[PDB]
Protein backbone atom coordinates (compact mmCIF):
# COMPACT_ATOMS: atom_id res chain seq x y z
CA UNK A 1 0.00 0.00 0.00
CA UNK A 2 0.96 3.58 -0.41
CA UNK A 3 2.17 5.72 2.48
CA UNK A 4 2.01 9.23 2.06
CA UNK A 5 5.14 10.84 3.25
CA UNK A 6 4.42 12.53 7.46
CA UNK A 7 6.71 15.40 6.83
CA UNK A 8 4.89 16.54 3.89
CA UNK A 9 2.40 17.49 6.95
CA UNK A 10 4.91 19.12 9.19
CA UNK A 11 4.42 22.14 10.86
CA UNK A 12 8.33 23.37 10.53
CA UNK A 13 9.26 21.79 7.21
CA UNK A 14 12.58 19.83 7.15
CA UNK A 15 16.30 21.37 6.94
CA UNK A 16 18.67 18.60 5.50
CA UNK A 17 21.26 21.26 4.80
CA UNK A 18 23.64 21.38 8.23
CA UNK A 19 24.28 24.99 7.56
CA UNK A 20 24.57 25.80 11.56
CA UNK A 21 24.65 23.23 14.47
CA UNK A 22 21.59 21.82 15.95
CA UNK A 23 19.71 24.32 17.79
CA UNK A 24 17.35 23.15 20.28
CA UNK A 25 13.56 23.31 19.76
CA UNK A 26 13.14 24.23 23.54
CA UNK A 27 11.44 27.31 24.39
CA UNK A 28 10.12 26.54 27.41
CA UNK A 29 12.62 25.35 30.38
CA UNK A 30 10.20 23.52 33.31
CA UNK A 31 11.91 22.53 36.51
CA UNK A 32 15.23 24.91 35.94
CA UNK A 33 18.14 25.47 38.42
CA UNK A 34 19.62 27.70 35.66
CA UNK A 35 17.65 30.04 33.28
CA UNK A 36 17.03 28.91 29.79
CA UNK A 37 18.90 31.93 28.47
CA UNK A 38 21.80 30.69 30.07
CA UNK A 39 21.39 27.92 28.39
CA UNK A 40 20.72 28.64 25.12
CA UNK A 41 24.06 30.59 24.80
CA UNK A 42 26.41 29.29 21.90
CA UNK A 43 29.59 27.60 22.23
CA UNK A 44 33.04 28.40 20.40
CA UNK A 45 34.89 25.89 18.21
CA UNK A 46 37.44 23.86 20.34
CA UNK A 47 33.30 22.59 17.00
CA UNK A 48 30.93 25.57 17.91
CA UNK A 49 27.61 24.07 19.12
CA UNK A 50 24.60 24.21 21.59
CA UNK A 51 25.41 23.22 24.70
CA UNK A 52 22.00 20.60 27.09
CA UNK A 53 20.02 22.85 28.16
CA UNK A 54 19.16 20.53 30.52
CA UNK A 55 22.72 19.69 31.40
CA UNK A 56 22.98 21.63 34.99
CA UNK A 57 19.54 20.17 36.03
CA UNK A 58 20.59 16.52 35.20
CA UNK A 59 24.36 16.82 37.34
CA UNK A 60 22.69 18.72 40.28
CA UNK A 61 19.25 17.73 40.70
CA UNK A 62 18.45 15.47 42.84
CA UNK A 63 16.52 11.88 42.64
CA UNK A 64 13.26 10.96 44.42
CA UNK A 65 13.68 9.49 47.73
CA UNK A 66 11.41 6.51 46.69
CA UNK A 67 14.20 5.22 43.91
CA UNK A 68 16.76 5.07 47.00
CA UNK A 69 14.26 2.57 49.20
CA UNK A 70 13.72 -1.07 48.95
CA UNK A 71 10.24 -1.00 47.68
CA UNK A 72 8.39 -4.56 47.47
CA UNK A 73 7.10 -5.09 43.55
CA UNK A 74 4.03 -3.79 42.12
CA UNK A 75 3.17 -6.13 39.48
CA UNK A 76 1.90 -5.18 35.70
CA UNK A 77 -1.20 -4.83 35.13
CA UNK A 78 -3.52 -7.72 33.38
CA UNK A 79 -3.15 -6.61 29.50
CA UNK A 80 -6.84 -7.17 29.59
CA UNK A 81 -7.99 -5.12 32.10
CA UNK A 82 -7.23 -2.15 29.39
CA UNK A 83 -6.83 -1.07 26.05
CA UNK A 84 -4.24 1.13 25.31
CA UNK A 85 -4.82 4.89 25.02
CA UNK A 86 -4.40 6.57 21.57
CA UNK A 87 -3.15 10.22 22.02
CA UNK A 88 -3.47 11.98 18.56
CA UNK A 89 -5.28 15.10 19.28
CA UNK A 90 -4.14 18.34 21.40
CA UNK A 91 -6.98 17.87 23.97
CA UNK A 92 -5.99 13.96 24.46
CA UNK A 93 -2.38 14.98 25.28
CA UNK A 94 -3.28 17.56 27.18
CA UNK A 95 -5.44 15.13 29.65
CA UNK A 96 -2.47 12.32 29.60
CA UNK A 97 -0.09 15.11 30.65
CA UNK A 98 -2.11 15.49 33.94
CA UNK A 99 -2.33 12.09 34.76
CA UNK A 100 1.39 11.56 34.06
CA UNK A 101 1.71 14.92 36.20
CA UNK A 102 0.47 12.11 38.89
CA UNK A 103 2.58 9.67 38.69
CA UNK A 104 6.00 8.85 40.66
CA UNK A 105 7.43 7.19 37.46
CA UNK A 106 6.59 6.23 34.40
CA UNK A 107 8.08 3.92 31.36
CA UNK A 108 9.07 5.64 28.00
CA UNK A 109 9.68 3.93 24.78
CA UNK A 110 9.93 5.33 20.89
CA UNK A 111 9.64 3.74 17.59
CA UNK A 112 12.01 5.76 15.09
CA UNK A 113 12.02 5.40 10.97
CA UNK A 114 14.94 5.78 8.73
CA UNK A 115 14.04 4.57 5.08
CA UNK A 116 11.83 7.59 4.30
CA UNK A 117 13.68 10.29 5.72
CA UNK A 118 16.85 11.63 5.77
CA UNK A 119 17.57 11.48 9.64
CA UNK A 120 15.13 9.86 10.20
CA UNK A 121 11.65 10.63 12.34
CA UNK A 122 10.04 9.96 15.87
CA UNK A 123 6.96 7.81 14.61
CA UNK A 124 5.35 6.69 18.08
CA UNK A 125 5.58 7.14 21.64
CA UNK A 126 5.10 4.92 24.11
CA UNK A 127 4.27 5.81 27.73
CA UNK A 128 3.02 3.27 30.50
CA UNK A 129 2.20 4.33 34.00
CA UNK A 130 1.22 1.75 37.22
CA UNK A 131 -2.35 2.09 35.89
CA UNK A 132 -2.16 1.99 32.16
CA UNK A 133 -0.59 2.49 29.13
CA UNK A 134 -0.26 5.62 26.31
CA UNK A 135 0.66 5.42 22.53
CA UNK A 136 1.70 8.66 21.40
CA UNK A 137 1.09 9.57 17.58
CA UNK A 138 4.55 11.71 17.50
CA UNK A 139 3.91 12.40 13.45
CA UNK A 140 0.75 14.38 14.44
CA UNK A 141 1.77 15.74 17.35
CA UNK A 142 5.36 16.70 16.61
CA UNK A 143 4.85 20.37 17.50
CA UNK A 144 2.96 19.49 20.59
CA UNK A 145 5.13 16.95 22.49
CA UNK A 146 7.20 19.62 24.33
CA UNK A 147 4.86 20.03 26.87
CA UNK A 148 5.54 16.80 28.20
CA UNK A 149 9.07 18.68 29.35
CA UNK A 150 6.91 19.31 32.65
CA UNK A 151 7.55 15.87 33.63
CA UNK A 152 10.14 14.22 31.46
CA UNK A 153 12.52 17.07 33.35
CA UNK A 154 10.74 16.68 36.85
CA UNK A 155 13.33 14.63 38.82
CA UNK A 156 10.85 13.28 41.36
CA UNK A 157 9.35 11.07 38.55
CA UNK A 158 11.02 8.64 37.61
CA UNK A 159 11.98 8.05 33.86
CA UNK A 160 11.93 4.05 32.95
CA UNK A 161 14.11 3.55 29.30
CA UNK A 162 15.36 -0.06 28.53
CA UNK A 163 18.54 1.63 26.60
CA UNK A 164 17.74 5.13 26.23
CA UNK A 165 20.56 5.85 23.96
CA UNK A 166 19.11 6.91 21.39
CA UNK A 167 15.84 7.78 21.83
CA UNK A 168 17.19 10.70 24.07
CA UNK A 169 19.07 12.34 21.20
CA UNK A 170 15.73 11.39 18.95
CA UNK A 171 13.71 12.82 21.83
CA UNK A 172 15.30 16.57 21.56
CA UNK A 173 16.08 16.28 17.54
CA UNK A 174 12.19 15.99 16.94
CA UNK A 175 9.89 16.77 19.61
CA UNK A 176 12.72 18.76 21.72
CA UNK A 177 12.31 16.72 24.79
CA UNK A 178 14.58 16.14 27.71
CA UNK A 179 15.27 14.23 30.43
CA UNK A 180 16.35 14.24 34.06
CA UNK A 181 15.32 11.66 36.25
CA UNK A 182 16.69 8.93 33.92
CA UNK A 183 16.69 5.33 34.99
CA UNK A 184 17.90 2.82 32.33
CA UNK A 185 17.27 -1.08 32.43
CA UNK A 186 19.97 -2.16 29.75
CA UNK A 187 22.36 -0.54 32.55
CA UNK A 188 20.42 -1.89 35.59
CA UNK A 189 20.79 -5.45 33.72
CA UNK A 190 24.29 -5.03 33.38
CA UNK A 191 25.41 -4.21 36.46
CA UNK A 192 23.61 -6.74 37.59
CA UNK A 193 25.22 -9.04 35.43
CA UNK A 194 22.36 -11.02 33.81
CA UNK A 195 23.09 -13.34 30.67
CA UNK A 196 21.48 -10.88 28.44
CA UNK A 197 20.45 -7.18 28.38
CA UNK A 198 17.92 -7.37 25.58
CA UNK A 199 14.34 -5.85 26.65
CA UNK A 200 13.24 -9.23 24.89
CA UNK A 201 15.31 -11.10 27.43
CA UNK A 202 13.82 -9.26 30.12
CA UNK A 203 9.97 -9.74 28.99
CA UNK A 204 10.71 -13.02 28.56
CA UNK A 205 12.15 -13.84 31.98
CA UNK A 206 10.47 -10.90 33.90
CA UNK A 207 6.84 -10.80 32.37
CA UNK A 208 7.11 -13.88 30.12
CA UNK A 209 5.85 -11.99 27.22
CA UNK A 210 7.50 -13.35 24.00
CA UNK A 211 8.32 -11.03 21.80
CA UNK A 212 8.13 -11.24 17.77
CA UNK A 213 11.48 -10.92 16.06
CA UNK A 214 11.17 -8.36 12.82
CA UNK A 215 8.36 -5.54 13.69
CA UNK A 216 10.90 -2.73 14.56
CA UNK A 217 11.35 -3.58 11.13
CA UNK A 218 8.15 -2.47 10.32
CA UNK A 219 6.65 1.32 8.84
CA UNK A 220 5.39 2.38 12.09
CA UNK A 221 4.40 5.61 9.97
CA UNK A 222 1.14 4.02 8.34
CA UNK A 223 -2.03 4.74 10.32
CA UNK A 224 -4.20 3.27 11.82
CA UNK A 225 -1.48 0.54 13.34
CA UNK A 226 -2.10 -2.72 12.92
CA UNK A 227 -2.96 -4.80 15.84
CA UNK A 228 0.06 -6.84 15.83
CA UNK A 229 1.70 -3.77 15.88
CA UNK A 230 -0.51 -1.83 18.86
CA UNK A 231 0.22 -4.68 20.94
CA UNK A 232 3.89 -4.91 20.71
CA UNK A 233 4.73 -1.20 20.96
CA UNK A 234 2.07 -0.98 24.25
CA UNK A 235 4.00 -4.42 25.31
CA UNK A 236 7.31 -2.25 25.25
CA UNK A 237 6.48 0.00 28.43
CA UNK A 238 3.24 -2.12 29.59
CA UNK A 239 5.81 -4.77 31.79
CA UNK A 240 8.82 -2.33 32.17
CA UNK A 241 8.00 -0.69 36.03
CA UNK A 242 8.11 -3.90 37.28
CA UNK A 243 10.84 -4.85 36.00
CA UNK A 244 12.29 -1.50 37.01
CA UNK A 245 11.05 -2.33 40.86
CA UNK A 246 13.23 -5.61 40.72
CA UNK A 247 15.89 -4.77 39.00
CA UNK A 248 16.57 -1.43 41.40
CA UNK A 249 15.95 -3.71 44.81
CA UNK A 250 18.37 -5.83 43.87
CA UNK A 251 21.12 -2.80 42.74
CA UNK A 252 19.57 -1.48 46.46
CA UNK A 253 20.98 -5.30 47.44
CA UNK A 254 24.06 -5.62 45.77
CA UNK A 255 25.74 -2.31 46.11
CA UNK A 256 25.38 -1.00 43.05
CA UNK A 257 22.25 1.31 42.39
CA UNK A 258 24.50 4.48 42.65
CA UNK A 259 26.46 3.34 39.30
CA UNK A 260 23.30 2.38 37.67
CA UNK A 261 21.97 6.22 38.12
CA UNK A 262 25.65 7.66 36.92
CA UNK A 263 25.17 6.10 33.51
CA UNK A 264 21.68 6.91 33.57
CA UNK A 265 22.72 10.26 33.89
CA UNK A 266 25.44 10.16 31.13
CA UNK A 267 22.64 8.55 28.58
CA UNK A 268 20.47 11.26 29.76
CA UNK A 269 23.13 13.75 28.76
CA UNK A 270 23.84 12.94 25.61
CA UNK A 271 23.29 15.62 23.05
CA UNK A 272 21.92 15.39 19.52
CA UNK A 273 23.97 17.34 16.81
CA UNK A 274 24.68 17.23 12.80
CA UNK A 275 27.96 15.17 11.73
CA UNK A 276 29.47 18.19 10.27
CA UNK A 277 29.28 19.64 14.03
CA UNK A 278 30.49 16.20 15.23
CA UNK A 279 33.16 16.30 18.21
CA UNK A 280 36.79 16.23 17.09
CA UNK A 281 37.69 13.51 19.74
CA UNK A 282 35.16 9.84 19.90
CA UNK A 283 33.05 9.94 22.94
CA UNK A 284 30.08 8.03 24.24
CA UNK A 285 28.68 11.90 25.17
CA UNK A 286 28.24 12.64 21.81
CA UNK A 287 26.34 11.30 18.90
CA UNK A 288 26.25 12.30 15.61
CA UNK A 289 24.87 10.55 12.42
CA UNK A 290 28.51 10.08 10.30
CA UNK A 291 31.73 9.63 11.47
CA UNK A 292 34.00 6.88 10.07
CA UNK A 293 36.44 6.08 7.37
CA UNK A 294 35.22 6.49 3.49
CA UNK A 295 32.96 3.58 3.43
CA UNK A 296 33.47 2.61 -0.34
CA UNK A 297 36.53 1.04 -0.26
CA UNK A 298 34.86 -2.26 1.71
CA UNK A 299 32.86 -1.62 -1.02
CA UNK A 300 35.36 -1.71 -3.71
CA UNK A 301 36.90 -4.97 -2.13
CA UNK A 302 33.97 -6.87 -1.08
CA UNK A 303 32.32 -6.28 -5.07
CA UNK A 304 36.12 -6.80 -6.18
CA UNK A 305 36.01 -3.66 -8.02
CA UNK A 306 39.26 -2.26 -10.40
CA UNK A 307 41.27 -0.53 -7.82
CA UNK A 308 41.26 2.70 -10.59
CA UNK A 309 37.40 3.30 -9.51
CA UNK A 310 37.42 5.32 -6.22
CA UNK A 311 36.31 8.31 -7.23
CA UNK A 312 33.52 6.73 -9.55
CA UNK A 313 33.06 5.40 -6.12
CA UNK A 314 32.96 8.59 -4.06
CA UNK A 315 31.02 10.13 -6.65
CA UNK A 316 28.22 8.15 -6.06
CA UNK A 317 28.12 8.46 -2.86
CA UNK A 318 28.17 12.09 -2.94
CA UNK A 319 25.33 11.91 -5.45
CA UNK A 320 23.33 9.19 -3.29
CA UNK A 321 23.98 11.61 -0.11
CA UNK A 322 22.96 14.70 -1.90
CA UNK A 323 19.91 13.78 -3.17
CA UNK A 324 18.32 11.34 -0.34
CA UNK A 325 19.32 15.23 1.79
CA UNK A 326 17.38 16.85 -1.25
CA UNK A 327 14.50 14.85 -1.44
CA UNK A 328 14.50 14.03 2.54
CA UNK A 329 15.24 9.88 1.96
CA UNK A 330 17.70 7.53 3.32
CA UNK A 331 20.80 6.81 1.38
CA UNK A 332 19.67 2.83 0.46
CA UNK A 333 15.96 3.79 -0.62
CA UNK A 334 17.58 5.83 -2.90
CA UNK A 335 20.35 3.35 -3.91
CA UNK A 336 21.28 0.48 -1.98
CA UNK A 337 24.94 -0.05 -1.48
CA UNK A 338 24.56 -3.20 -3.45
CA UNK A 339 22.98 -1.29 -6.71
CA UNK A 340 26.15 0.90 -6.32
CA UNK A 341 27.89 -1.70 -6.59
CA UNK A 342 26.55 -2.84 -9.77
CA UNK A 343 26.80 0.49 -11.21
CA UNK A 344 30.48 0.82 -10.62
CA UNK A 345 31.15 -2.94 -11.60
CA UNK A 346 29.02 -2.64 -14.70
CA UNK A 347 29.84 0.86 -15.78
CA UNK A 348 26.43 1.29 -17.81
CA UNK A 349 26.88 3.90 -20.01
CA UNK A 350 23.44 4.83 -21.65
CA UNK A 351 19.81 5.44 -20.09
CA UNK A 352 18.99 1.64 -20.88
CA UNK A 353 22.11 0.12 -19.11
CA UNK A 354 21.86 1.69 -16.15
CA UNK A 355 17.77 0.74 -15.50
CA UNK A 356 17.97 -2.67 -17.17
CA UNK A 357 21.46 -3.65 -14.27
CA UNK A 358 20.61 -7.29 -13.61
CA UNK A 359 20.00 -6.05 -9.91
CA UNK A 360 16.84 -4.01 -11.12
CA UNK A 361 17.13 -0.26 -10.30
CA UNK A 362 14.85 2.18 -7.52
CA UNK A 363 13.21 4.94 -8.91
CA UNK A 364 15.94 7.61 -7.80
CA UNK A 365 17.84 5.37 -10.09
CA UNK A 366 15.51 5.24 -12.97
CA UNK A 367 15.09 9.12 -13.07
CA UNK A 368 18.57 10.04 -12.96
CA UNK A 369 19.00 7.28 -15.40
CA UNK A 370 21.16 9.60 -17.72
CA UNK A 371 23.03 11.98 -15.01
CA UNK A 372 24.10 8.62 -14.22
CA UNK A 373 25.14 7.54 -17.24
CA UNK A 374 27.36 10.40 -18.11
CA UNK A 375 28.61 10.34 -14.43
CA UNK A 376 30.09 6.83 -15.48
CA UNK A 377 31.01 7.84 -19.17
CA UNK A 378 33.14 11.04 -17.91
CA UNK A 379 34.72 8.52 -15.21
CA UNK A 380 35.18 5.74 -18.47
CA UNK A 381 36.69 8.33 -20.56
CA UNK A 382 38.63 10.40 -17.56
CA UNK A 383 40.13 6.58 -16.29
CA UNK A 384 41.83 6.29 -20.15
CA UNK A 385 42.35 9.70 -20.79
CA UNK A 386 43.81 10.27 -17.29
Not at 63 to 81: N, V
Not at 192 to 206: C, D, M, T, V
Not at 282 to 293: C, L, N
Amino acid sequence: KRVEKPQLKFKSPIDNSESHPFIPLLKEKPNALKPLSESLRLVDDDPSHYPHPYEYEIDHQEYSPEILQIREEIPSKSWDDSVPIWVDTSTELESMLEDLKNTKEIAVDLEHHDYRSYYGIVCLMQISTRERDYLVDTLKLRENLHILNEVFTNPSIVKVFHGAFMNIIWLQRDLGLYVVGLFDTYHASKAIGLPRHSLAYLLENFANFKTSKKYQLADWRIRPLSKPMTAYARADTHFLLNIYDQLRNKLIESNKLAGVLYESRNVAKRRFEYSKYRPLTPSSEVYSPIEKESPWKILMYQYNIPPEREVLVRELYQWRDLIARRDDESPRFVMPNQLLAALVAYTPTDVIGVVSLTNGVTEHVRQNAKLLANLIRDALRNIKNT
